[PDB]
Amino acid sequence: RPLWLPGSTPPAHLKGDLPGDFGFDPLGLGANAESLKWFKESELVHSRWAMAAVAGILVQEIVRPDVFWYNAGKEVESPLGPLGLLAVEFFLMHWVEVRRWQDLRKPGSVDQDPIFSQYKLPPHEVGYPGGVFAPFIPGDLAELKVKEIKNGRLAMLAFVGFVMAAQVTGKGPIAALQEHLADPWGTTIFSKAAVVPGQAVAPPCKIPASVSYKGIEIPTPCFLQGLWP
Amino acid sequence: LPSWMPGADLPGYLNGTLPGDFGFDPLYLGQDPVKLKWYAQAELMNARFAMLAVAGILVPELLSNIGPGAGVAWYDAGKFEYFAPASSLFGVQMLLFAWVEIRRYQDFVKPGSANQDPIFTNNKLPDGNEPGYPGGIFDPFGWSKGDIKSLKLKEIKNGRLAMLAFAGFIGQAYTTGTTPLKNLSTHLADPWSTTVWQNDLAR
Amino acid sequence: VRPVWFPGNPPPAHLDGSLAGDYGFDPLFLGQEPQTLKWYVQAELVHGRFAMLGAAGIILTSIGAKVGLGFPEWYDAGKVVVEKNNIDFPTLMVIQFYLMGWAETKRWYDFKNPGSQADGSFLGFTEEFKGLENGYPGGRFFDPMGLSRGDAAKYQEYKQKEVKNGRLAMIACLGFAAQYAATGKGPLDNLADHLADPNHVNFATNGVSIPI
Amino acid sequence: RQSWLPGSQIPAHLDTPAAQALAGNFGFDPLGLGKDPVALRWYQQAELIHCRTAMAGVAGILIPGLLTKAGALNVPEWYDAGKVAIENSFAPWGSLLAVQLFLCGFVEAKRWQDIRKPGSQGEPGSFLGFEASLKGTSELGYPGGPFDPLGLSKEADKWADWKLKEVKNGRLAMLAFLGFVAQKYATGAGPVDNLAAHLKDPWHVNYATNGVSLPFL
Amino acid sequence: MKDFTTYLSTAPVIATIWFTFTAGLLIEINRYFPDPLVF
User: Fold this and answer.
1) How many CB pairs under 8 A join A and B?
2) What dihedral angle (degrees, nearest 10) is formed by the CA atoms of A89, A93, A95, A98?
3) Smallest CA–CA separation between B49 and chain A, in Å?
4) Which residues of this UniProt protein bind chlorophyll a 13 (chain D) (predicted)?
5) Which CATH class name applies to E1-39?
6) Would you call C121 and D3 a contact, using CB atoms and an 8 Å cutoff?
7) Which residues are within 8 A (CB) of D29 and not within 5 positions of it... i.e. 6 or more apart?
8) DSSP state of C209
């Protein structure tokens, strides 16, 4: 079995049934199956969120450059009332999330379109609605799920590294890429900072301070500033 | 079992025998059967009264905003002549409302006891007593042709709805000092800046 | 056979190695009595966890101080924050009192009666206030991640590490108290100082600790 | 069962058919003052008396004082209302005092004799027609006839409910009176105003800020 | 240890400690509240 370590031994509760495992849980927290399903769900959740996020940020930096995706929160504009937008947002989200959670806590219990009785989703797996939720399927879930989880974990890493690269350079990830390409040698946190018993150094942040939006003036500190190297 | 919460856990006692029962009692306050009766009746009364109340609110407002004895705001209590002093008429009322109250209650405690005109013994209600649903003279248009249940369900539904309606009326009136139709027209002009938080934060 | 706190001598009677951190160290036989011993177990656990809290907050704040983040020195921090804010010292204190009193009383009467606190007399919760062991209230709340309910072996190892780091944190916070009591400075400052000159930055250089 | 303190042990005499069958028991007897049956019975009666009196008093304080915040019903402060009334009155305060002493004394003596013997004032012919309804209702502290006119003592369902609510609200009314007089000593202000102030700023309107309750601060 | 506990539960030492406790109580009382005459 392909393992996250060549030549090592998987733990107890890890075998390989669920895709995306290769015997990795050094803390062995996958003991309780309840929390384990909980965490499978949560990891799928985060992976999908982050995949969507990186995709959107990338394509947007592409087509509409010079718009700091990080500062889109600030510099967005729309004639619609922001309060109404966030209201619709909250309510929509409360609904969808309570649906998914009610189904998790009680499997196969909400599978119907409660409006159109004709419409009702077939039986499926928690974390795998499908049917209408997956109408067209080329290939096999055997590979689809493994690719899903792989790409999702990778995209989580992508998103967080984008955030770091912004906090350190303020540049969009593509800008930072072109920068790295320009100087392969000097474009490294290595070439940016280091720590020694004599003295320590860290790169300064580009996210300036409390952002002054339309009256609120959001306090904008840094992520764990003092321990960046 | 239509539930206020699909897949949830209904209480045992709630069994749909009353219209509008979606198994809703998160506080288990209807475990006593006598209490359940008391409160079925109270829901009915307060809800139906809220119905007729919000109707008496809306209708004359709608007529005033169109092309007529008065166009006064519904909460403008002490202000009208009505050719008679309020206190006297109020005493009249309390007596007569007490009259439903007493025979309503009598038939609730002892069913099938109040059917006749006590004056005109011939003039009498049938056996379809159903404490809370007399009918007969209370159903002169040949209704109750349907079973009872569609009308009962829509009844309890609209009654709860009207209770909420009146609550909104009084609350938003205390806050805005305005009339409900006007408030709704404002929300229609713009909903995007007419919200609770809009106005409580302007407050 | 287990490594004694003092190699060569045999351990005491009421000390065997059943609980984590047992190296046979009760030269004063305070745990001769089972009830008192178990009580002491719980007390040591509580105090060690508190010391862990103390060390963590201290070191974080001290880093925030030394690096230019404007974080006050801990022994000044309480005063400076109550001053920077419009808070009322007695109000803070009394609310904190309320809270610690209620929770600690629950713990106390659970030590008294081992399981009466999970009876569900509380709002609606049951066994979520049921102690797994003395000083080990492992439940859905005090162990939502459920480490105790898997691999009891690694769990015992974790208990070992817990008491270990706990005694370490106790001695650490005492050390910090001493560093300030001596130098009047930040412990991280004194740290960088000993870094500068271990040969000439120490208690022997303080001359206060050793009064010669 | 519902205990004043979970985990803790229940007082034996409190854990008895009579006591647990009296009302509102929670095992609350730290000092153990009702071990004697006669004693605890007396105390039950006493708690009843105090409950009802305190309910009445707090009503007479709040409701008039509440509606004096409303436009109508200009009434003074409760503690000064004594002076106000003796001013607006006609008979001397000592006089009306002695009168009401007579009045209360007679019926209190009645209650007394009945507690001594439940079938005491049912002594036929002692009064013209009293005895008939002047007998107890098998629960000392629960007379009948004129007592419970509307006949709410007949339905056993709501019986213990009325009882529990009675004892609850009565104890709470005691506490209300105590808080009122306490904040009258400390703040010196009317309780409604004290409430208004604590509403305006609980964070600074409290005995914590009075420097009265806790002067060492 | 239990021997020690018993030795402490012996009588004259208990009389001792109770008296010490009471006396320190009253001495501190007079310290913080000097010169009491009435009330």
Assistant:
1) 21
2) -160
3) 31
4) 165, 169
5) mainly alpha
6) yes
7) D11, D13, D14
8) S
β-partners of residue D143 are: D136
Distance from C-alpha of A187 to C-alpha of A200, rounded to nearest angstrom: 19
Helix D159-186 crosses helix D191-200 at what angle (to 10 degrees)? 80
Report d(CA A146, CA A127) in Å as an integer: 14
Contacts of C85 (CB under 8 A, 6+ apart): none
DSSP annotation of C128 reads T
Those residues with Cβ within 8 angstroms of residue A161's Cβ, 6 or more apart along the chain or in another chain: A173
The interface residues of chain C toward chain E in range 24-43, judged by CB-CB distance below 8 A, are: 28-30, 32-33
Instruction: Look up residue D91 and give its two tokens.
Output: 């008979």
Q: Which residues of E touch C15 (CB under 8 A)?
A: none
Q: Determination method here?
A: cryo-EM
Sort residue E36 into left (φ over 0), alpha (ψ -120 to 50) or beta. Answer: beta
Q: Is B116 on the interface with A (CB under 8 A)?
A: no
Place of tokens 């609770």: B196
**Six token digits for residue C182:** 């001596």
Residue type, B37: K
Quick check: E2 and C30 CB within 8 A?
A: no
Taking contacts as CB-CB distances below 8 angstroms, the residues of chain A near B192 are 80-81, 83-84
Chain A residue at shortest CA distance from B195: A84
Touch between A and D (at least 3 CB pairs under 8 Å): no
**Amino acid found at D63:** I
- Other CB atoms within 10 Å distance of the CB of residue D165: 13
Residues of chain D immediately before an interruption (C to N > 2.5 Å): none
Give contacts of D8 with chain C, Cβ < 8 Å: 109, 112
- Domain definitions of chain E by residue range: 1-39
